[PDB]
Amino acid sequence: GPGSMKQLEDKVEELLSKNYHLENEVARLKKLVSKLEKQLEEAQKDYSEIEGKLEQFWHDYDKLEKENKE
Amino acid sequence: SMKQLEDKVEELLSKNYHLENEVARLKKLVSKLEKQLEEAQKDYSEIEGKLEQFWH
Amino acid sequence: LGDFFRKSKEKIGKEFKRIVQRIKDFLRNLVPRTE
């Protein structure tokens, strides 16, 4: 009756409130994951651009030293 | 109904169980990405250290 | 740290170019009569 129905209605409300908070936490953690993934991708992209520029300079200097050795 | 509320209790118990495990997976992935960003930081600062070591 | 990689990319570019330019100034000073 009303007593047993109240226990279930209370339990649904309790589980619904926890469900809502858990869904907010999942949506928050996914945005943070995608934010960190983009930062890591950009840091790795800029690092390789730095790397290639330093490689090209070393390569050009290597040929310079060889041509000015003899 | 009583059966409707009993079914939703079991439905919510199951959804909350997987959501808790999803939060656990997402926090471990965040931790993995923070360490990867920490290592990328050391790689950047390593280039800075090499450039500084030219003057001395 | 926010904007660490942006700041460090700028620092790396400024410091390496500084090394390249000071090598350039040093070598240019060795040859006062070059054309």
Numbering used by the authors:
A (entry chain B): 35 to 104
B (entry chain A): 38 to 93
C (entry chain E): 2 to 36
Quote the study that presented this structure, word for word.
M proteins are the major surface-localized virulence factor of the widespread and potentially deadly bacterial pathogen Streptococcus pyogenes (Group A Streptococcus or Strep A). One of the primary functions of M proteins is to enable Strep A to evade human innate and adaptive immune responses. LL-37 is a member of the cathelicidin antimicrobial peptide family and constitutes a major host immune defense against Strep A, as well as other pathogens.
Success was had with a version of M87 protein (amino acids, aa 68–105) that had a portion of the canonical coiled-coil protein GCN4 (aa 250–278) fused in register to its N-terminus. The structure of the GCN4-M87/LL-37 complex was determined through molecular replacement to 2.1 Å resolution limit. The structure revealed a single LL-37 molecule bound to a dimer of GCN4-M87. GCN4-M87 was likewise in α-helical conformation throughout, but strikingly, only the GCN4 portion formed a coiled coil while the M87 α-helices were unfurled and asymmetrically disposed. The two M87 α-helices and the LL-37 α-helix together formed a parallel, three-helix bundle. Most notably, a number of hydrophobic M87 amino acids that occupied the core a or d positions and contacted each other in the free form, as is typical of coiled coils, were exposed in the bound form and instead contacted the hydrophobic face of the amphipathic LL-37 α-helix. Near the N-terminus of LL-37, a consecutive pair of phenylalanines, Phe5 and Phe6, was surrounded by hydrophobic a and d position amino acids of M87–Leu74 (a, usual position in heptad), Ala77 (d), and Tyr81 (a) from M87α along with Ala77 from M87α2. Lastly, one more helical turn further in LL-37 were Ile20, which was surrounded by M87α1 Phe91 (d) and Trp92; Val21, which packed against M87α2 Phe91; and Arg23 whose aliphatic side-chain atoms packed against M87α1 Trp92. These hydrophobic contacts were supplemented by a sparingly few polar ones, which occurred all within a small polar break in the hydrophobic face of LL-37, near its N-terminus: LL-37 Ser9 and Lys12 formed a hydrogen bond and salt bridge, respectively, with M87α1 Glu85, and in one of the two complexes, LL-37 Lys12 also formed a salt bridge with M87α1 Glu89.
